[PDB]
Structure formats: structure tokens, C-alpha cells
């Protein structure tokens, strides 16, 4: 999965 913090 991408991860819920990947885009910060």
C-alpha cells in the first residue's frame, strides 16, 4: 500500500 503519510 502507499501509506497514509507518504504524501507529506
Amino acid at each position, epitope marked *: *500500500a*502507499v*501509506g*497514509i*503519510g*507518504a504524501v*507529506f
Partner: antibody
Amino acid sequence: QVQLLQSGAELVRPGASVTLSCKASGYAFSDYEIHWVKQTPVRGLDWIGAFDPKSGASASNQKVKGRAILTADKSSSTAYMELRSLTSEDSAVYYCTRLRYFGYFDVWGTGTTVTVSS
Amino acid sequence: DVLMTQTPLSLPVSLGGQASISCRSSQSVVYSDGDTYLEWYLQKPGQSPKLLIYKVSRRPSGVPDRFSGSGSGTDFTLKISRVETEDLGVYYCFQGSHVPYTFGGGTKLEIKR
């Protein structure tokens, strides 16, 4: 040798809250997110939510929404999920699992069997 | 959310045969980086789910090449090539691209002996 430590069981009365804990062992806690998955009997997995130690961001699935509170104690290497106002539909085995960014669920806890009953 | 429709519900297969499990997403599961986070998991009785396949077709070390995955767009397939006694359990597809992440309904492998 990486491990995630979970309680074996919790008996919860209807309307009460449960707090589940996931304690990491053998890796640096802040490098991985902790995700929670619900396994219904015989069949079914549901992603319930996640907490990211590095950024502090949290999320949960909207089917349970308003009732899941996800947190982490970085000094204990421990992740927490509070589930409020339980009913019979919330009885299941709850797993935690870890996830690196753009990775996958490589390590899993052994699961907490949650029963909602009077 | 992204719906994951998995078929068949129950898969009888003889020892040494070939099993194939399909998953159909309600939408494209390509992520903004260009990668697709389709994963396959096996839950053996009494145990936690374990990953077999990640990014549609990639295989972590320790997973035999008898397990293989493929997929375009909405359609994804997992193939077990020579079923072994230990391959029994419930298999799940999973999309990890869009929050909330979702699992398919699961496919129980039954081994004919």
C-alpha cells in the same frame, strides 16, 4: 526477528469501549506506519485504520467512523486504536500490521479476539 | 470506496493442479506515482494473513514462483501452479492505492486428495 505484540482477547459489554494496543519489537518504530485489519468469522478482512509515527497522520475506514481513535506512544514503540460504543457487529479478531511508505504489510500481530456480550 | 469483487467463493483443486483466482476492482487502482498497489494475501487456518504478491506481479523472497500475479486496469488474476497441501486457506486480493484500502471477499482453496 521483528514482532508486533497484541492482547489475546477482550470481553466488552455493549455500548462500552475497547482499546487495542500493538507494541513493536525489533525495529525502529517511527520508520513504519501501523495499520489495523478486522477479520470476521469464516470469511472477510476489513481495513479499519492506520497511524503514521513519522508524520503523526491518522486515518480510518468510514464504516466505523466517529468510533475509531488512532494514536501512538513513540517512547513505548506502541500503537493504539480505541473503538467506542461497541455492538455485536464489532465482535471479530483484530490484527495490527506494519507498512513502510510505498511498501506492503510484511509483519503481522497475532490478533485480539474481541467479543461484545453482556 | 474501491470495490473488489473476488471469484470464485470456493475453489476445489487436486494436489498438483492449477488454481486461478480473479479480482475485479470498481475503478482503476493506478497511483499518482505510476505504480499499481494490487496485493494478494493468504490466511491459513489459525494464522495471520501473509503477503504473496505485491505491485500486481512482484514476489517477495520466501514466496515460491508457483504463485504468480497479473493484471490490467480493473482485472487482476492470481495463479497457484502446483497446489501443495500447505497452500490451503482463504486468499484475498487487496488494493493499497486509495484510502480506505479494501480487500476482496476471499476465496477458500479446498484440496482434493
